[PDB]
Amino acid sequence: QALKKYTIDLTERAEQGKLDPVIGRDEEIRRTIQVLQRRTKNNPVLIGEPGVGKTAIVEGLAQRIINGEVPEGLKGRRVLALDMGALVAGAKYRGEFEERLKGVLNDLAKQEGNVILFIDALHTMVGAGMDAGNMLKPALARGELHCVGATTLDEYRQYIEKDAALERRFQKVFVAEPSVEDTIAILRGLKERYELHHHVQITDPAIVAAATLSHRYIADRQLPDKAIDLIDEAASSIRMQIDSPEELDRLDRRIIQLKLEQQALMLDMLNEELSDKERQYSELEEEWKAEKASLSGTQTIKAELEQAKIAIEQARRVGDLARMSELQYGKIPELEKQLEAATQLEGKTMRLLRNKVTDAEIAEVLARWTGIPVSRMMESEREKLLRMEQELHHRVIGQNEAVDAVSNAIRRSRAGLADPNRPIGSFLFLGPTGVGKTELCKALANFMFDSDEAMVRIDMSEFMEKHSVSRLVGAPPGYVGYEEGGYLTEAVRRRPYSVILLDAVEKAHPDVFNILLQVLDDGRLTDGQGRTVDFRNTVVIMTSNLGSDLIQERFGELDYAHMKELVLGVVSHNFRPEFINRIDEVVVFHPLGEQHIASIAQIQLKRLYKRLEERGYEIHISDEALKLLSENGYDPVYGARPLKRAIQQQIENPLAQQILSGELVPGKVIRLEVNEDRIVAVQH
Amino acid sequence: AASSIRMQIDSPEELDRLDRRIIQLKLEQQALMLDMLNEELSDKERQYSELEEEW
Amino acid sequence: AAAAAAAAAAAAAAAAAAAAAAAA
Ligand SMILES: Nc1ncnc2c1ncn2[C@@H]1O[C@H](COP(=O)(O)OP(=O)(O)OP(O)(O)=S)[C@@H](O)[C@H]1O
Ligand SMILES: Nc1ncnc2c1ncn2[C@@H]1O[C@H](COP(=O)(O)OP(=O)(O)OP(O)(O)=S)[C@@H](O)[C@H]1O
């Protein structure tokens, strides 16, 4: 008449079996029942950071009711879940909603403690209009309503520390996030449920993988819900792999290619090759159909097992005698033995394949979930990693120890050997500039991510003053800078596997270094809104110049190590000594030899020829001209940029003079040959 | 605390242990029909009725 | 028989500024 017009019996859904194994949580549900059987303040309300399944603990209460695992005083009861949007949606006329609520409350009064009223998402019932707070304040006052509440911590603190009477009708139950192992047990029960659903096998090392890695690499949500994500999306992935198959797809592309080619040929013998590949495809397809039939039989036998489990639970709730034992004892001899026969048959026959969710599926859903590259080494990435020195000396010549330390950092990343208290490997760079510090970091970014700026390059001259820490972390709440957050925490919390360069750091004012002390030690770090962000999958690199006189004076006649100690003492006199203690390693640069200079000139010529061929102009060059550029573009005092700009001069100015002269014919090899002291461009 | 003691009063423990035991052995004995589980069932049901009446 | 409607009742926040005031 009124009740089931708007309410949901979850205990019926437990009888319907559409609910789920609620595992552990017994202390919590006990304390719930304790608050249920009070005199005053009878109404419990659940509190925790979301993901911990307050809905689940309510439904597990309902399951323990239907099982009769509760004590006696709450047996035979009702737990009925009430939407408010069910209540509202027809309230055209005034008072209509209020009459609905009033009739519901009076019929709850008529049930006389039969019903545990459950209301999800409780702070809706705060606001519906007075609406329900006063309009359940009599039912609050009487305690005949035994409402059970559910919320985030916040809307408790928003809305319920606002009223007093509503506060003192409800009793905080601080539901905690579980640990690793209770979550593991919950995962095993719902592993059984997920293999019931998604046509799979799930391996217990994949469970411990899900627990461990989601405890490391997801800084957003909490347990168990992230592990639910991992397992469920791996289930989807295996489902799609079995629904695909790639080898069938390769052969179908091959046969339609050869079919088109033969129909163009209509000598052929491609007729024979097409027929052979069609035969091969048909064989593998028939194998695929047989495997599909095998897994389909597996799903049917598992589903009939589950139907038997539901029926014997009906017999456990009601109290059927000997029919349940006869059903079990007759049934799962044969279903256990031909389940194992189908299991060994699939272990034979699956080729084209996988049915066990392993760790590798979890890792691939990780490295495509956020995208920290944790999956084990597919070799093009791995053999690209192993050539990393040559990769960098595609773009960065010399500075070899720096290259080595950087590659060591990348390797200790991908081996999984990084301590997750910390970022991957931090660096301070040194030496007088233009020797390829910022360009080395950009070359890393071109490697790892395939862009220069897709990396976080924040030069520090934005940060010379105390106040502009809010340019990176941000504004505290309650201002105008509340809708664009930070910029550093943003450009991590999008893509937490990224390079962060803070080039030329020692301009800045050292409260920026206070921020960066929290950075380099722990990697969680308070953003602007009053929460935190992971850093533990980044690399933070900073630069300097500060032993410029020292290195331009003394890189000769010294080793690497005492040079390091000397300029380390210099920066000790500059920074605080913690911030050089926090570094993974300081790497010291050096003045340069003319072979590096010539290689640099080669690199810039290749860039130049790229631009000119995009323009459409074509060059061979004197390399005596390169020698004269080398002899003129040298200095010890700077390095590479004066070479660059001298080359810029002594080529590109008279060259572009001749180009915008309308003089040089496109397509002709522009021989850059020397003059006596200039370098000529001819057309021959 | 009163609610805790009320819940402790409201349900037994070892009686429910033995109740699960005897319904399990009932299932098993009906699955048999060597038995002797008849005798073990009678013993445990006697113990169950004793503790039940004490409760 | 007369029914109801639903209203806007809209406004904005109040903001603050904040001012550094340099030492030297
Ligand atoms: N012990 C558990 N047993 C079974 N499922 C669980 C358990 N713990 C969590 N879950 C699942 O976790 C998911 C989310 O749980 P909830 O805590 O209900 O979500 P929530 O954070 O409470 O937000 P809402 O308002 O409940 S949707 C649900 O699908 C539950 O099934
Ligand atoms: N090994 C190298 N490979 C390629 N280009 C280099 C190399 N060393 C220096 N350069 C050039 O010299 C400059 C180095 O650029 P940057 O890395 O910004 O200079 P830096 O070493 O970072 O020091 P600052 O802070 O910029 S003065 C660029 O113009 C590069 O083209």
Side-chain angles (χ1 to χ4, degrees), chain A residues 392-399 429-442 457 501 503-504 543-545 589 592 596 599-600 603-604 607 639-641 644:
Chain A
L392 293 176
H393 292 285
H394 288 171
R395 293 188 71 189
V396 173
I397 193 60
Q399 300 299 329
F429 291 172
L430 291 175
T433 65
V435 298
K437 299 179 278 191
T438 315
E439 292 290 331
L440 180 63
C441 298
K442 293 173 187 174
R457 180 191 181 275
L501 169 63
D503 194 356
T543 58
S544 169
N545 53 356
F589 283 15
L592 306 175
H596 308 89
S599 179
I600 284 169
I603 292 163
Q604 302 307 313
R607 169 183 283 177
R641 292 191 188 99
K644 294 176 71 170

CSV table of all heavy atoms in Angstrom, one decimal, chain A residues 392-399 429-442 457 501 503-504 543-545 589 592 596 599-600 603-604 607 639-641 644, ligand 2:
chain,number,residue,atom,x,y,z
A,392,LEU,N,71.4,8.5,-26.0
A,392,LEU,CA,71.6,9.8,-25.6
A,392,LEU,C,72.7,10.5,-26.4
A,392,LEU,O,72.6,11.7,-26.7
A,392,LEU,CB,72.0,9.9,-24.1
A,392,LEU,CG,70.7,9.5,-23.3
A,392,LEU,CD1,71.1,9.4,-21.8
A,392,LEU,CD2,69.6,10.4,-23.5
A,393,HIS,N,73.7,9.7,-26.8
A,393,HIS,CA,74.7,10.3,-27.7
A,393,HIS,C,74.2,10.3,-29.1
A,393,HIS,O,75.0,10.7,-30.0
A,393,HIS,CB,76.0,9.6,-27.5
A,393,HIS,CG,76.6,9.8,-26.2
A,393,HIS,ND1,77.3,11.0,-25.9
A,393,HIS,CD2,76.7,9.0,-25.1
A,393,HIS,CE1,77.7,10.9,-24.7
A,393,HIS,NE2,77.4,9.7,-24.2
A,394,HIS,N,73.0,9.9,-29.4
A,394,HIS,CA,72.3,10.5,-30.6
A,394,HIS,C,72.1,12.0,-30.5
A,394,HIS,O,72.1,12.7,-31.5
A,394,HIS,CB,71.0,9.8,-30.9
A,394,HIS,CG,71.2,8.4,-31.4
A,394,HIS,ND1,70.1,7.6,-31.5
A,394,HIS,CD2,72.3,7.8,-31.8
A,394,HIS,CE1,70.5,6.4,-32.0
A,394,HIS,NE2,71.8,6.5,-32.2
A,395,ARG,N,71.9,12.5,-29.2
A,395,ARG,CA,71.7,13.9,-29.1
A,395,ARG,C,72.6,14.6,-28.2
A,395,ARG,O,72.8,15.8,-28.3
A,395,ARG,CB,70.2,14.2,-28.6
A,395,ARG,CG,69.2,13.8,-29.6
A,395,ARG,CD,67.8,14.2,-29.2
A,395,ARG,NE,67.7,15.7,-29.3
A,395,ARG,CZ,66.7,16.4,-28.9
A,395,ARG,NH1,65.7,15.8,-28.3
A,395,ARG,NH2,66.7,17.7,-29.0
A,396,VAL,N,73.3,14.0,-27.2
A,396,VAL,CA,74.1,14.6,-26.2
A,396,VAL,C,75.5,14.0,-26.3
A,396,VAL,O,75.7,12.8,-25.9
A,396,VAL,CB,73.5,14.5,-24.8
A,396,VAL,CG1,74.5,15.0,-23.8
A,396,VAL,CG2,72.2,15.2,-24.8
A,397,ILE,N,76.4,14.7,-26.8
A,397,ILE,CA,77.8,14.2,-26.9
A,397,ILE,C,78.5,14.5,-25.6
A,397,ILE,O,78.3,15.6,-25.0
A,397,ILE,CB,78.5,14.7,-28.2
A,397,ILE,CG1,79.8,13.9,-28.4
A,397,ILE,CG2,78.8,16.2,-28.1
A,397,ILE,CD1,79.5,12.4,-28.6
A,398,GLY,N,79.4,13.6,-25.2
A,398,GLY,CA,80.1,13.9,-24.0
A,398,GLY,C,79.3,13.8,-22.7
A,398,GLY,O,78.1,13.4,-22.8
A,399,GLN,N,79.8,14.3,-21.7
A,399,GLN,CA,79.2,14.3,-20.3
A,399,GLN,C,78.8,12.9,-19.9
A,399,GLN,O,77.7,12.7,-19.5
A,399,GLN,CB,78.1,15.3,-20.3
A,399,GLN,CG,78.5,16.8,-20.6
A,399,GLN,CD,79.5,17.3,-19.6
A,399,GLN,OE1,79.5,16.9,-18.4
A,399,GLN,NE2,80.4,18.2,-20.0
A,429,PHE,N,72.4,19.0,-11.2
A,429,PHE,CA,73.5,19.1,-12.2
A,429,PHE,C,74.3,20.3,-11.9
A,429,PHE,O,73.9,21.2,-11.2
A,429,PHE,CB,72.9,19.2,-13.6
A,429,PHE,CG,72.2,18.0,-14.1
A,429,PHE,CD1,71.5,18.1,-15.3
A,429,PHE,CD2,72.2,16.8,-13.4
A,429,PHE,CE1,70.8,17.0,-15.8
A,429,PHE,CE2,71.6,15.7,-13.9
A,429,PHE,CZ,70.9,15.8,-15.1
A,430,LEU,N,75.6,20.3,-12.4
A,430,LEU,CA,76.4,21.5,-12.1
A,430,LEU,C,77.1,21.9,-13.4
A,430,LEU,O,76.8,21.4,-14.5
A,430,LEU,CB,77.5,21.1,-11.1
A,430,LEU,CG,77.0,20.9,-9.7
A,430,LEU,CD1,78.1,20.5,-8.8
A,430,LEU,CD2,76.4,22.2,-9.2
A,431,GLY,N,78.0,22.9,-13.3
A,431,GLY,CA,78.9,23.3,-14.4
A,431,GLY,C,78.4,24.5,-15.1
A,431,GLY,O,77.2,24.8,-15.0
A,432,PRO,N,79.2,25.2,-15.8
A,432,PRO,CA,78.8,26.4,-16.5
A,432,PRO,C,78.0,26.1,-17.7
A,432,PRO,O,78.3,25.2,-18.5
A,432,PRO,CB,80.1,27.1,-16.9
A,432,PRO,CG,81.1,25.9,-17.0
A,432,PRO,CD,80.7,25.0,-15.9
A,433,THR,N,77.0,26.9,-18.0
A,433,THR,CA,75.8,26.5,-18.7
A,433,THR,C,76.1,26.4,-20.2
A,433,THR,O,77.1,26.9,-20.7
A,433,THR,CB,74.6,27.4,-18.5
A,433,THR,OG1,74.9,28.6,-19.1
A,433,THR,CG2,74.3,27.5,-17.1
A,434,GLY,N,75.2,25.9,-20.9
A,434,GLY,CA,75.4,25.6,-22.3
A,434,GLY,C,76.2,24.4,-22.6
A,434,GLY,O,76.6,24.2,-23.7
A,435,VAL,N,76.4,23.5,-21.6
A,435,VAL,CA,77.1,22.3,-21.8
A,435,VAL,C,76.1,21.1,-21.9
A,435,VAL,O,76.5,20.0,-21.7
A,435,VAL,CB,78.2,22.0,-20.8
A,435,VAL,CG1,79.2,23.1,-20.9
A,435,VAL,CG2,77.6,22.1,-19.4
A,436,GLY,N,74.8,21.4,-22.0
A,436,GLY,CA,73.9,20.4,-22.3
A,436,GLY,C,73.3,19.8,-21.0
A,436,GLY,O,73.4,18.6,-20.7
A,437,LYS,N,72.8,20.7,-20.1
A,437,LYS,CA,72.1,20.2,-18.9
A,437,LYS,C,70.6,20.2,-19.2
A,437,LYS,O,70.0,19.1,-19.1
A,437,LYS,CB,72.4,21.2,-17.8
A,437,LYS,CG,73.8,21.2,-17.5
A,437,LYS,CD,74.2,22.2,-16.4
A,437,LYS,CE,74.3,23.6,-16.9
A,437,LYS,NZ,74.9,24.4,-15.9
A,438,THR,N,70.0,21.3,-19.5
A,438,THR,CA,68.6,21.4,-19.9
A,438,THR,C,68.3,20.5,-21.1
A,438,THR,O,67.3,19.8,-21.2
A,438,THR,CB,68.2,22.8,-20.1
A,438,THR,OG1,68.7,23.7,-19.1
A,438,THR,CG2,66.7,23.0,-20.2
A,439,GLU,N,69.3,20.5,-22.0
A,439,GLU,CA,69.1,19.7,-23.2
A,439,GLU,C,69.2,18.2,-22.9
A,439,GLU,O,68.5,17.4,-23.6
A,439,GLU,CB,70.1,20.1,-24.3
A,439,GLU,CG,69.9,21.5,-24.8
A,439,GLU,CD,68.6,21.6,-25.7
A,439,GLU,OE1,68.2,20.6,-26.3
A,439,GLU,OE2,68.0,22.7,-25.7
A,440,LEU,N,70.0,17.9,-21.9
A,440,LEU,CA,70.0,16.5,-21.5
A,440,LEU,C,68.7,16.0,-21.0
A,440,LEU,O,68.2,14.9,-21.3
A,440,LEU,CB,71.1,16.2,-20.5
A,440,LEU,CG,71.2,14.8,-20.1
A,440,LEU,CD1,71.6,13.9,-21.2
A,440,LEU,CD2,72.3,14.7,-19.0
A,441,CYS,N,68.1,16.9,-20.1
A,441,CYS,CA,66.8,16.5,-19.6
A,441,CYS,C,65.7,16.5,-20.7
A,441,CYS,O,64.9,15.6,-20.7
A,441,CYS,CB,66.4,17.5,-18.5
A,441,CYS,SG,67.6,17.4,-17.2
A,442,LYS,N,65.8,17.4,-21.6
A,442,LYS,CA,64.9,17.3,-22.8
A,442,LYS,C,65.1,16.1,-23.6
A,442,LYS,O,64.2,15.6,-24.2
A,442,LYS,CB,65.0,18.6,-23.6
A,442,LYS,CG,64.6,19.8,-22.9
A,442,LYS,CD,64.9,21.0,-23.8
A,442,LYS,CE,64.7,22.3,-23.2
A,442,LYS,NZ,65.2,23.4,-24.1
A,457,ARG,N,59.0,21.5,-17.1
A,457,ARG,CA,60.2,22.3,-17.1
A,457,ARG,C,59.8,23.7,-16.5
A,457,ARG,O,59.2,24.5,-17.2
A,457,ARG,CB,60.7,22.5,-18.5
A,457,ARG,CG,61.9,23.4,-18.6
A,457,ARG,CD,62.1,23.8,-20.0
A,457,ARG,NE,63.3,24.7,-20.1
A,457,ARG,CZ,63.3,26.0,-19.9
A,457,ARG,NH1,62.1,26.6,-19.6
A,457,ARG,NH2,64.4,26.7,-20.0
A,501,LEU,N,61.9,18.8,-14.5
A,501,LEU,CA,63.1,19.7,-14.4
A,501,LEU,C,62.8,20.9,-13.7
A,501,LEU,O,61.8,21.6,-14.1
A,501,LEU,CB,63.6,20.0,-15.8
A,501,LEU,CG,64.7,21.1,-15.8
A,501,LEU,CD1,65.9,20.7,-15.1
A,501,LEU,CD2,65.0,21.4,-17.3
A,503,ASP,N,65.0,23.9,-13.7
A,503,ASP,CA,66.3,24.3,-14.2
A,503,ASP,C,66.7,25.5,-13.4
A,503,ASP,O,65.9,26.4,-13.1
A,503,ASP,CB,66.2,24.6,-15.7
A,503,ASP,CG,67.5,24.7,-16.3
A,503,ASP,OD1,68.5,24.7,-15.7
A,503,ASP,OD2,67.5,24.9,-17.6
A,504,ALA,N,68.0,25.6,-13.2
A,504,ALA,CA,68.7,26.8,-12.6
A,504,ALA,C,68.2,27.2,-11.3
A,504,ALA,O,67.5,28.2,-11.1
A,504,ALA,CB,68.7,27.9,-13.6
A,543,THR,N,69.3,21.9,-11.8
A,543,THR,CA,70.6,22.4,-12.3
A,543,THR,C,71.1,23.6,-11.6
A,543,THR,O,70.4,24.2,-10.8
A,543,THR,CB,70.5,22.7,-13.8
A,543,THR,OG1,69.5,23.7,-13.9
A,543,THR,CG2,70.1,21.5,-14.6
A,544,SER,N,72.3,24.1,-12.1
A,544,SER,CA,73.0,25.1,-11.4
A,544,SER,C,74.0,25.7,-12.3
A,544,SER,O,74.0,25.5,-13.5
A,544,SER,CB,73.7,24.6,-10.1
A,544,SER,OG,74.6,25.6,-9.6
A,545,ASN,N,74.9,26.5,-11.7
A,545,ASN,CA,76.2,26.7,-12.4
A,545,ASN,C,77.4,26.7,-11.4
A,545,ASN,O,78.5,27.0,-11.8
A,545,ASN,CB,76.2,28.0,-13.1
A,545,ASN,CG,75.8,29.1,-12.3
A,545,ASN,OD1,75.4,28.9,-11.1
A,545,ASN,ND2,75.8,30.3,-12.8
A,589,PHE,N,79.7,18.5,-14.2
A,589,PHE,CA,80.0,18.5,-15.6
A,589,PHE,C,81.5,19.0,-15.8
A,589,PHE,O,82.2,19.1,-14.9
A,589,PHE,CB,79.0,19.4,-16.4
A,589,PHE,CG,77.8,18.7,-16.7
A,589,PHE,CD1,77.4,17.6,-16.0
A,589,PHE,CD2,77.0,19.0,-17.8
A,589,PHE,CE1,76.2,16.9,-16.2
A,589,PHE,CE2,75.8,18.4,-18.1
A,589,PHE,CZ,75.5,17.3,-17.3
A,592,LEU,N,85.0,21.1,-22.4
A,592,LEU,CA,84.7,20.3,-23.5
A,592,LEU,C,85.8,20.3,-24.5
A,592,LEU,O,86.7,21.2,-24.6
A,592,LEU,CB,83.5,20.9,-24.2
A,592,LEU,CG,82.3,21.2,-23.2
A,592,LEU,CD1,81.2,21.9,-23.9
A,592,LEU,CD2,81.8,19.8,-22.7
A,596,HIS,N,83.9,16.9,-29.4
A,596,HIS,CA,82.5,17.1,-29.0
A,596,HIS,C,81.9,18.3,-29.7
A,596,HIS,O,80.8,18.3,-30.2
A,596,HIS,CB,82.4,17.4,-27.5
A,596,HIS,CG,83.1,16.3,-26.7
A,596,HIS,ND1,84.4,16.4,-26.3
A,596,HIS,CD2,82.6,15.2,-26.1
A,596,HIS,CE1,84.7,15.4,-25.6
A,596,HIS,NE2,83.7,14.6,-25.5
A,599,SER,N,81.1,17.3,-33.2
A,599,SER,CA,79.9,16.5,-33.2
A,599,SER,C,78.7,17.4,-33.1
A,599,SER,O,77.7,17.2,-33.7
A,599,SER,CB,80.0,15.5,-32.2
A,599,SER,OG,78.8,14.7,-32.2
A,600,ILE,N,78.8,18.4,-32.2
A,600,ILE,CA,77.7,19.4,-32.0
A,600,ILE,C,77.4,20.1,-33.3
A,600,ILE,O,76.3,20.3,-33.7
A,600,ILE,CB,78.1,20.3,-30.9
A,600,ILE,CG1,77.9,19.6,-29.5
A,600,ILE,CG2,77.3,21.6,-30.9
A,600,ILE,CD1,78.5,20.4,-28.4
A,603,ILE,N,75.5,18.0,-35.5
A,603,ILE,CA,74.1,17.9,-35.1
A,603,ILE,C,73.3,19.1,-35.5
A,603,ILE,O,72.2,19.0,-36.0
A,603,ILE,CB,74.1,17.7,-33.6
A,603,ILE,CG1,74.6,16.3,-33.2
A,603,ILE,CG2,72.7,17.9,-33.0
A,603,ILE,CD1,75.0,16.2,-31.7
A,604,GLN,N,73.9,20.3,-35.4
A,604,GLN,CA,73.2,21.5,-35.8
A,604,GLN,C,73.1,21.6,-37.3
A,604,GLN,O,72.0,22.1,-37.8
A,604,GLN,CB,73.9,22.7,-35.2
A,604,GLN,CG,73.9,22.5,-33.7
A,604,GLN,CD,72.6,22.3,-33.1
A,604,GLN,OE1,71.6,22.9,-33.4
A,604,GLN,NE2,72.5,21.2,-32.2
A,607,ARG,N,70.1,19.5,-38.1
A,607,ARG,CA,68.9,20.2,-37.9
A,607,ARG,C,68.7,21.3,-39.0
A,607,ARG,O,67.5,21.5,-39.4
A,607,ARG,CB,69.0,20.9,-36.5
A,607,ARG,CG,68.0,22.0,-36.3
A,607,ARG,CD,68.1,22.8,-35.0
A,607,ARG,NE,67.7,22.0,-33.8
A,607,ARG,CZ,67.8,22.5,-32.6
A,607,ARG,NH1,68.3,23.7,-32.4
A,607,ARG,NH2,67.4,21.8,-31.5
A,639,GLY,N,81.5,27.5,-24.1
A,639,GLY,CA,81.1,26.2,-24.6
A,639,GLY,C,80.3,26.4,-25.9
A,639,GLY,O,80.7,27.0,-26.8
A,640,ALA,N,79.1,25.8,-25.8
A,640,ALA,CA,78.5,25.3,-27.1
A,640,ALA,C,77.7,26.5,-27.8
A,640,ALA,O,77.7,26.5,-29.0
A,640,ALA,CB,77.5,24.2,-26.8
A,641,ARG,N,77.0,27.3,-27.0
A,641,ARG,CA,76.2,28.4,-27.6
A,641,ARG,C,77.0,29.3,-28.4
A,641,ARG,O,76.4,29.8,-29.5
A,641,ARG,CB,75.4,29.1,-26.5
A,641,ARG,CG,74.3,28.3,-25.9
A,641,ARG,CD,73.4,29.1,-25.0
A,641,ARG,NE,72.4,28.3,-24.3
A,641,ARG,CZ,72.6,27.9,-23.0
A,641,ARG,NH1,73.6,28.4,-22.3
A,641,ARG,NH2,71.7,27.2,-22.4
A,644,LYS,N,77.3,27.8,-31.7
A,644,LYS,CA,76.0,27.8,-32.3
A,644,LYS,C,75.8,29.1,-33.0
A,644,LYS,O,75.4,29.2,-34.2
A,644,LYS,CB,74.9,27.4,-31.3
A,644,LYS,CG,75.1,26.1,-30.8
A,644,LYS,CD,74.0,25.8,-29.8
A,644,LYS,CE,72.7,25.7,-30.4
A,644,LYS,NZ,71.6,25.2,-29.5
D,2,LIG,N1,76.2,17.4,-25.5
D,2,LIG,C1,75.4,18.3,-26.2
D,2,LIG,N2,74.6,17.8,-27.2
D,2,LIG,C2,73.9,18.7,-27.8
D,2,LIG,N3,73.8,20.0,-27.7
D,2,LIG,C3,74.5,20.4,-26.7
D,2,LIG,C4,75.4,19.7,-25.9
D,2,LIG,N4,76.0,20.4,-24.9
D,2,LIG,C5,75.6,21.7,-25.2
D,2,LIG,N5,74.7,21.7,-26.2
D,2,LIG,C6,74.1,23.0,-26.7
D,2,LIG,O1,74.3,24.0,-25.7
D,2,LIG,C7,73.1,24.4,-25.1
D,2,LIG,C8,72.8,23.6,-23.9
D,2,LIG,O2,71.5,24.0,-23.6
D,2,LIG,P1,71.1,24.0,-22.1
D,2,LIG,O3,71.1,22.5,-21.6
D,2,LIG,O4,70.0,24.8,-21.9
D,2,LIG,O5,72.3,24.6,-21.5
D,2,LIG,P2,72.5,24.1,-20.1
D,2,LIG,O6,73.7,23.2,-20.1
D,2,LIG,O7,71.2,23.6,-19.6
D,2,LIG,O8,72.9,25.3,-19.2
D,2,LIG,P3,72.0,26.5,-19.1
D,2,LIG,O9,71.2,26.6,-17.7
D,2,LIG,O10,70.9,26.4,-20.2
D,2,LIG,S1,73.2,28.0,-19.4
D,2,LIG,C9,72.1,24.2,-26.2
D,2,LIG,O11,72.0,25.3,-27.1
D,2,LIG,C10,72.5,22.9,-26.8
D,2,LIG,O12,72.3,22.9,-28.2
